[PDB]
Amino acid sequence: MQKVEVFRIPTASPDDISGLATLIDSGKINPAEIVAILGKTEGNGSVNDFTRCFATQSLAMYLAEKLGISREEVVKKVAFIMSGGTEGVMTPHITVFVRKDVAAPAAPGKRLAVGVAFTRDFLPEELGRMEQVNEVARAVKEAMKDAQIDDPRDVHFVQIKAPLLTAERIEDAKRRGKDVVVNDTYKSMAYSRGASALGVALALGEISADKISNEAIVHDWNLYSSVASTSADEIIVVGNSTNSASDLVIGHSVMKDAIDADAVRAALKDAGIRSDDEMDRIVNVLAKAEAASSGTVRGRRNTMLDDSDINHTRSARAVVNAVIASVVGDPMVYVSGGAEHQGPDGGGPIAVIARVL
Amino acid sequence: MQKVEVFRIPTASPDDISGLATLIDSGKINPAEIVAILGKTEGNGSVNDFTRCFATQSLAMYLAEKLGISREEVVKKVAFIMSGGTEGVMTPHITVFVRKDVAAPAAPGKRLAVGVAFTRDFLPEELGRMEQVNEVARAVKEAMKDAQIDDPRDVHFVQIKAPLLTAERIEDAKRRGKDVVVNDTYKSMAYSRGASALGVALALGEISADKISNEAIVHDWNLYSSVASTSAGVCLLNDEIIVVGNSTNSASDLVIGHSVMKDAIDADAVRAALKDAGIRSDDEMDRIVNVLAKAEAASSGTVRGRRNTMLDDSDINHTRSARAVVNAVIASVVGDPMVYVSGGAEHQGPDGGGPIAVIARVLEH
Amino acid sequence: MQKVEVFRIPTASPDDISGLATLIDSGKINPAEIVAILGKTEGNGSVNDFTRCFATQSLAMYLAEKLGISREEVVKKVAFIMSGGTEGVMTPHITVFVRKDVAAPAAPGKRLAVGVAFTRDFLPEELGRMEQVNEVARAVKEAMKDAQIDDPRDVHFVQIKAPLLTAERIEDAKRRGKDVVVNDTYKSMAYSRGASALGVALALGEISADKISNEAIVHDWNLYSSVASTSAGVCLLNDEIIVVGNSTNSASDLVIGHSVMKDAIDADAVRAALKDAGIRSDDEMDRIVNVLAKAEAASSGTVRGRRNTMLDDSDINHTRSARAVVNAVIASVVGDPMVYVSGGAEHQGPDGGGPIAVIARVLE
Amino acid sequence: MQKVEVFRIPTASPDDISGLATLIDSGKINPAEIVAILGKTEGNGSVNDFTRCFATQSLAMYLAEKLGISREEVVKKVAFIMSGGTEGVMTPHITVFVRKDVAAPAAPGKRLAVGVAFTRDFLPEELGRMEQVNEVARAVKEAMKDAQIDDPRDVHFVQIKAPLLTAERIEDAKRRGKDVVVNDTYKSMAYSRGASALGVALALGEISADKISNEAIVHDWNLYSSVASTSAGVCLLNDEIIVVGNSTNSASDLVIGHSVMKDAIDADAVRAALKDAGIRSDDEMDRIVNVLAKAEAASSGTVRGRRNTMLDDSDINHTRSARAVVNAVIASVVGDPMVYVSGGAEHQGPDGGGPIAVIARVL
């Protein structure tokens, strides 16, 4: 029987392993049972943001030394998804997911479950195109099976690490007689995120296949997933299963715009938190944020897209973090920017992991 | 009988007067009755933010031409308080305060009232010191009289335009054998804002005189006003005071209420301020005319014990982040990001928090 | 006979008219003879940069009050070109161009001449396309005629004010069944600047017409003008053209020369432009009136084979870095950071470079 | 006999060790003979810039694995000086200093020499104060002895990696009843850099001791060293001193020279430093190994009487602008933007200026 444990650990810097080291050294976490670490690191969240890699390197070194294995093996075994940008009051932190096989009965109802799956490698001319959608969908279905979750309504978060294009890979594509979707590495990141999210939506039945095409993969924003969170294949499916002995559950909603506190409260209620006085049972909140293309919120203009000093994803992260912190009373929550085909234009999925009663 | 009207006007740019012109040309506003305009302008919100002066120059030009007087007279007649910095989802806009003398009875209970007062000019060596505190207090009392407000519990917003130090005034002080509080223009802005807010607190009985001293004017963050909102700028000669509250002798269809944000994410204080302005449920939100609030990064570097990078971030200044944060919180409470959030809250609410006021239409009056 | 005078005036702020007012009050400048003012103003040089408009509004007010005419007429009569962004050591300032008709013979040789011309209004669907190229070329030719300059080799600066797209203009174009070059206001600025610069190059014979097409207007960076300096408009909807060069029929005590910076550190091009304006050694620098240059980040991400981060830096926009760099280079050559450098150089010099001109006093 | 070799290596990212690995694998550098690595890394150069420690961590890992020793020993054996911030056209890169003991005759005249010294640990209450000045001076003299340099006029670069205050050390000082020079870690970096540079100036005889006091240590900017280059950092302890100069008892194929930039656009001082390093015409530029320079915003807010906004820009830190400017000036003089420019020059050149040194090949 599977038991999932989730640890929200404050960090002092991208390389701070002290909270994790404390949890391993106290016996609460067997490092061999760690399956994923999702971080908010305090760099600028830009292309040339190496704090994500600094955090990943430091955690892999620490765990490799604790486990007696190489850094390469740790990075092959554990997903490392580092979301840069800690604007506003957002608190840098890591959320560590541990999965144990325990022989004990479940508890009343359904409880937290996690599954992992990988896709095949993509050719450069396949990024941002239907091949990526379909391979991601397949891997998502496999991850649901791994989690022993059969109902897509019980899937609450699909975390993806997706590839990107470099100049060298574009030259490879050109040499082989192929054209890439866009001759721009940064924009290629947007195309990879969007294709991956549409693949998630396809796998879960949130959109129908006849509505998805290559031309739609950066154009039709009416197509989006309510659970996808993609970052630039490795797949983590998080949901609830009847065959789980986890003392936790996950629920979610979708923010319609950057100030949609109602969606935050709906996600809280869906995770079993039914009043403000139960807030302390939250383990973590995970959300996507973005600037709406219209340049407005509820008909009100803002400068996010005109401001040459602060990039728009930084502002959106700060804003949505402030909103969530104001709902839940805690700014140490995960907010990630760039939500192509992830929730509506200007909004994004939001999930809550909470302890049961 | 006094009637105060307040108009919140979206702007397309710092120099956009079209919404105000529309209200004047349709007859809803007599420009001669405008007493103050309080703006959020979309520059970077710092010292070298010229969008504020741009907005003020454009409005003074427009109103001077509408009134048939000089810009100098318009600026002498109308308060122009421009808060730069529209970070996050905060929507650039202006709030126009109009005070009319109308022949109609006062409304039942207390209703929106505004009063005006000016201080004497200050010598450079007096800014940030007890002389400014005391002069601000006196002027606030005069402004309460102008507003027909006798009870300090009925004061809900005290807007101040305060001075700052320049190099020439510091040299003047030195030449006269005197020292100034700081040889730093930006810190002088902080000292002027803080002394003015403490003067408000003194005038309203929020703190006792025996607890206030020069050494306290920047060091003891336990001394603060819950209604003061202070702003430093160009003019810099006399403190200008606008008192906003409620009076029994007012025929306004509006009221003001307030609370204090305990921290940058204190949505509860937003709800308390809304209820104090007569909005008792989410379904009455549409009666809001405007929200006016102070925001800041806490000196501790934390919010409710959680670290953030606001004070270490060399890309985004901490007051920019704080404005974005508190504006976002308020917007999430009221469903509208077009509210006024102003930075730099020395002695205005607690360290890391700030006053929050709501001007709202009354119900069934 | 035409005489052009040029005054470089330090500013303390965007709305600072005090230096110009002082020059007017001393009798050195007749405001009725002012034809253009080109400023470097200290905002961030972006979309939401209102220091440019603040400077123009303040100057138009001042001149309206000095001349006894309305601001609308002043803005109709005098070119106001405010380039935001004063990064690095670059000093905010304005350069005022005055053109008088004086009764005096033709100074020996050729001397500074300036001409002005306006185009028709453009439809939103015309920006970034060949119609804009062709109209800009026409206007450059008209401005050359106004300046009494017949040789395109004698054009040393072509300053343009160009339109941009807003959401309303895009919707207007759409309603009539037309598509615009890009549904993006900032990129529309790039397309308008580039088409205008290619129109200048076309008018001056720097590139040949069959090689210019709509698809070429932002894709083929081998097409550029060596004297064009173009800037999207703040609030007007058209192109305004100032041609600055030298004419045999000029009595000016100044000349203009130019070169092209090949990259952001091409100090040699600075010295070549100086020599072309008659400054042949460091000891003649004091005859400089102003230096005018375009700057940009090269698309390659390198300078002389050396990588830089200008295009990856999410904190500092790349045009900001290029202005800081090229101004610093020029300042280090001439010993003065108070020179005009404007960013966004589509079809203005090579990829990663830009035109650079020097106006200097003669010695006769 | 001492031989110093210096290698300027382009980097693709903070963690890029490939160029160094190539130089080791080809036999040009024996890593056991590496004494220092000086980097320009492409982060923002601020407080929350972790690209510097990322570079140090990556190099220490690589060298530890190549040398068969622990990371701690690698960091004990090799100086790691990482200057973040590659603004303008400045190119990320590393400069590797290798010191060999070779049995070869003394080069004619003076040639490149390097010496190393460490100070004792400092108590928190000592940073930014005369005790730091004096200990730096002691270590500088020891490094000169190590370099076989007796004449301070032959010292052309004194690189110091000097400490800072942290919250834990301030709390330690508080527990023991002591106050620190400033209760601010970021400002503490400025005080430590300035005290260290004044210690350099003291050791080399560039300023007299009677002119130095605590009140002068962040106030009297007329007291400065023309060769000191000092740098503070969280990543690793900061008790390291490198003296670089020329000695008659050296068998190297390089020399070092220097000047002082009077302001951020002082190209004349660049040319003077090149000539001082043996580069006498533009056609000999190719003998440059590297240029190392300090840049800063002048307190006046002007350069040669012309105003700028560097100190007013709340979006771009003023040191970022100064690095971009000075890198552009040097690149325009030498024709190459891959040169070392580091920000924060307290007591390093005049207010608004900074030292500039050139390491160049002989002919």
Numbering used by the authors:
A (entry chain F): 1 to 232, 239 to 283, 289 to 368
B (entry chain A): 1 to 283, 289 to 370
C (entry chain E): 1 to 283, 289 to 369
D (entry chain H): 1 to 283, 289 to 368
Task: Quote the study on this structure.
The use of cyanuric acid hydrolase to solve this societal problem is being explored and the best candidate for this biotechnological application is the thermostable enzyme from Moorella thermoacetica. Consistent with the “Toblerone fold” observed for these enzymes, the RMCAH monomer is composed of three concatenated, highly divergent, but structurally homologous domains, which endows the enzyme monomer an internal pseudo-three-fold symmetry (Domains 1, 2). As observed for AtzD and ACAH, the active site of RMCAH lies on the pseudo-three-fold axis within each monomer and is formed by similar sets of residues from all three domains. As observed for ACAH and AtzD, each of the three serine γO atoms is in close proximity to a lysine residue (Lys40, Lys161 and Lys299), generating three pairs of Ser-Lys dyads each from one of the three isostructural domains from the same monomer.
To further probe functional importance of the domain 2 flexibility, we generated a double-mutant enzyme ‘RMCAH-CC’ (G53C/E235C) in which Gly53 and Glu253 from domain 1 and 2, respectively, have been changed to Cys. We confirmed that these two cysteines introduced near the domain1/2 interface can form a disulfide bond, by determining a crystal structure of RMCAH with several additional mutations C46S/C162A/C218V/G53C/E235C. This structure showed the domain 2 locked in a partially open conformation via the disulfide linkage. Notably, RMCAH-CC showed higher activity in the presence of 10 mM DTT than in the absence of DTT. This was in contrast to wild-type RMCAH that was slightly inhibited by the high concentration of DTT possibly due to an adduct formation involving cysteine residues near the active site.
